[PDB]
Structure formats: structure tokens, C-alpha cells
Design a protein around this ligand. Structure first.
Ligand SMILES: *[C@@H]1O[C@H](CO[C@@H]2O[C@@H](C)[C@@H](O)[C@@H](O)[C@@H]2O)[C@@H](O[C@@H]2O[C@H](CO)[C@@H](O)[C@H](O)[C@H]2NC(C)=O)[C@H](O)[C@H]1NC(C)=O
Ligand SMILES: *[C@@H]1O[C@H](CO)[C@@H](O[C@@H]2O[C@H](CO)[C@@H](O)[C@H](O)[C@H]2NC(C)=O)[C@H](O)[C@H]1NC(C)=O
Length: 336
């Protein structure tokens, strides 16, 4: 309903034609530098960059600044993020034996799933890169999400997330708290993504996360272009690498049926057996080992997490060049 106040270090504000607002914040005054553990202010400019968005038609951020989406305060609650009672999933997990994976990729099919209860529900698809357990669980997250209560509308939007204590008191979405350090001058996090058409054009969100071996910083690449990094200094268990990578969909059922009796959609809202063009997928299911080798785990190497298979589930499909994970569904019809 209302826009949040402009952040500190805002050099210029660009208003999009559709009501989006972008604050060009001085790269040295971005929220990340307000983190107590980020006293070590040295900004890694590049790992040891144009991405187009519709708001560029109204202006561009000057050099030395980054575009930050202005938050929309809806007045509705934003529930705690949760690693895979009212959350439901169709996710695959790759468990490494130690916290030494140096990166992971995910090419996620974009859709606009429908929400039965738009004021409280959400539906997302993402990667989870983690290390540790319980109070020490650290995560690196990126994907798309439909969450009107948080974002202001029902469009799939690019999001990032992180935690350093299993979501107890650290972490947040995008640049809403000190954590992630954005380096890209053109791409604002939190904007709408183009959804695919049923039986037609398919759109993908390619994301690559790579740990810099010299610094421990986890860099984010979208379609091969640097966006920024999650600093090593904000973490503890994942500073040397990750022990787990998970891919797939998730829904939040604010109706309280545990995700067992809601028609809130996951992926495209169609079950994985409908296939390419109809069901949503994740491809480029790869991670990087300790020695820099890219590994592509086979379908049998993953553990499936689909606690409501009659509502949302997953299915592997061997493509001609790589493995596909189809996932999602329409949910289950509520009882009358
Ligand atoms: C660190 O872990 C790697 C990988 O762990 C294995 O593979 C995972 C996918 C999962 O199934 C784990 O439970 C496995 O233990 C270890 O790499 C293995 O190393 C052995 C030789 O020691 C080799 O024969 C295997 O092929 C390797 N597996 C893979 C997948 O790379 C590695 O040894 C562990 N490091 C230490 C110091 O323990
Ligand atoms: C999959 O992950 C790998 C490993 O992080 C990415 O590989 C890097 O790709 C860039 C661009 O091609 C190269 O310059 C680097 O040398 C690669 N590193 C390694 C260790 O191979 C790869 O780009 C990712 N692919 C996708 C589609 O995200």
C-alpha cells in the first residue's frame, strides 16, 4: 500500500512507469556496510555487467552507485523463511559428505503460479546452498517468488535470502537488512521476471553461485553477469564451502491446511508429468567440488522432499544434454 522511506546514501531516485521505485545508493553506503561483522569495509569490486530491466527507460544509476528497489509496505505479515507446518515442498537435495562444495548452479523456469489466498500465501522456486545444522545452519539462497504480502503484487520476482543461525535472528530477503553486498550498477534485485506461457514461450532464471577461494566471499551471477556477493564475514559454518544443495519449489499455505488442502500453485500449477512447456522445471543441476570440478549428480544421487505428493510433487526427465527436474502442481482441492 505505501512505499518505505528512501535508504541512507541515496544519490538519485528513479520512478518506473508501473509504480516501481529505484534508489541509486552510493556503493559504499549500501545496507551491507551497517553490519557489525562487516567493519572490514574493503569492497571486493570484482571476483578474483549490464542486465536490462524496464525502469532503465526512465533513467540509470550513476557510476559508484547501485540500484535498490524501494520496499512496498503492504501492512500484511511476512512469515519466517524455512529450510526444506504450513509450508509445502517439492525439492531435491544433494547431500555432500563435508562442507567443501565451492558453488552451485540453477536454471529455473519462471512462472506466475496462482495463489488461493493472496494476502498471506506465497509460492517460490529457488536454490538453497547450506552448511551446518540447527542454530548453526548457514544458507545462500536465490530464486523467484510470488508473495503479494511482501512485494506488493502477484508477479514472480527475483529474490535472494541468507541466514547464519538457521533463521533464528539473522538474515533477510534481498537488501532489506545488512548482509549481501551488491556490486552491479544496472540490475535491481526484487523486480518482476517474465513468466512463461502454458504451451508457449518458456523463460528461465539462470543463477550461478561461486565461492572465491582467495576471500571466501560467495559471488552471485545471473545469466553469467556478476550481481554481488554474500561476504564470508557474515557466516560461520559455510565460510569454507557448503555441505548441502537443494533445488525446487515451495508454497506457504496461510489457510492452515498444512499445504494439503489448498489450490495455491507450485511451479506452473501443473504436475511434472505434463512436461516441457506445461510443468515448471529446474535444469543445470550442478555443483563445484573442493578441487574446482563441476559435478552433475545423477537422478539417483538426490533425495526427494515432497511431503504432499497428491498436491505437489517432482519428476526427473533425462534431457539430450542434461538432467531436468520437473516439479510443482495445482495443490489439492479444499473439502466443503
Ligand atoms: C569430502 O566429501 C567428499 C564427497 O563425499 C562423498 O560424496 C557425496 C556425494 C556423498 O555421497 C558423501 O556421503 C560421500 O562421502 C569425499 O570425496 C570422496 O573421496 C573418495 C576418496 O577419499 C572418492 O573415492 C570419492 O569418489 C569421493 N566422492 C565424491 C562424490 O567426490 C571426500 O573424501 C571428503 N573429504 C574428506 C577429507 O573426508
Ligand atoms: C555452472 O557452474 C560452473 C562452476 O561454477 C560455472 O563455471 C564457470 O563458468 C564461467 C563462464 O563460463 C567460467 O569462466 C569459469 O571458469 C567456470 N568455472 C568452473 C570452475 O568451471 C558455470 O558457468 C555454471 N553454469 C551455469 C549455466 O550457471
Amino acid at each position: 500500500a505505501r512505499l518505505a522511506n528512501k535508504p541512507k546514501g541515496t544519490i538519485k531516485t528513479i520512478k518506473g512507469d508501473d509504480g516501481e521505485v529505484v534508489d541509486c545508493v552510493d556503493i559504499y553506503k549500501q545496507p551491507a556496510f551497517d553490519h557489525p561483522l562487516l567493519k572490514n569495509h574493503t569492497l571486493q569490486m570484482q571476483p578474483s555487467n549490464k542486465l536490462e530491466q524496464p525502469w532503465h527507460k526512465n533513467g540509470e544509476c550513476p557510476k559508484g552507485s547501485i540500484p535498490i528497489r524501494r520496499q512496498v509496505i503492504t501492512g500484511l505479515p511476512v512469515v519466517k523463511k524455512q529450510f526444506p507446518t504450513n509450508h509445502q515442498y517439492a525439492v531435491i537435495a544433494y547431500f555432500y559428505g563435508n562442507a567443501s562444495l565451492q558453488g552451485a548452479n540453477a536454471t529455473i523456469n519462471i512462472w506466475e503460479p496462482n495463489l488461493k489466498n493472496p494476502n498471506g500465501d506465497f509460492s517460490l522456486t529457488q536454490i538453497w546452498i547450506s552448511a551446518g545444522s540447527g542454530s548453526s545452519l548457514n544458507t545462500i539462497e536465490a530464486g523467484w517468488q510470488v508473495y503479494p504480502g511482501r512485494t506488493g503484487d502477484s508477479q514472480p520476482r527475483f529474490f535472494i535470502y541468507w541466514t547464519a543461525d538457521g533463521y533464528t535472528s539473522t538474515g533477510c530477503y534481498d537488501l532489506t537488512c545488512p548482509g549481501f553486498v551488491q556490486t552491479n550498477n544496472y540490475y535491481a534485485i526484487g523486480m518482476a521476471l517474465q513468466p512463461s506461457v502454458y504451451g508457449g514461450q518458456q523463460y528461465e532464471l539462470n543463477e550461478s553461485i561461486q565461492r572465491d577461494p582467495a576471500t571466501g566471499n560467495w559471488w552471485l551471477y545471473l545469466w553469467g553477469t556478476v550481481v554481488g556477493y554474500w561476504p564470508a564475514s557474515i557466516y560461520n559454518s559455510i565460510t569454507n564451502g557448503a555441505d548441502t544443495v537443494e533445488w525446487g519449489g515451495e508454497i506457504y499455505d496461510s489457510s492452515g491446511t498444512g499445504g494439503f488442502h489448498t489450490t495455491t500453485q507450485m511451479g506452473s500449477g501443473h504436475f511434472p508429468t505434463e512436461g516441457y512447456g506445461k510443468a515448471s522445471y529446474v535444469r543445470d543441476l550442478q555443483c563445484v567440488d573442493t578441487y574446482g570440478n563441476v559435478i552433475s549428480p545423477t537422478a539417483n544421487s538426490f533425495q526427494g522432499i515432497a511431503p504432499a505428493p497428491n498436491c505437489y510433487n517432482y519428476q526427473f526427465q533425462q534431457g539430450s544434454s542434461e538432467l531436468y527436474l520437473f516439479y510443482g502442481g495445482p495443490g489439492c482441492q479444499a473439502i466443503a
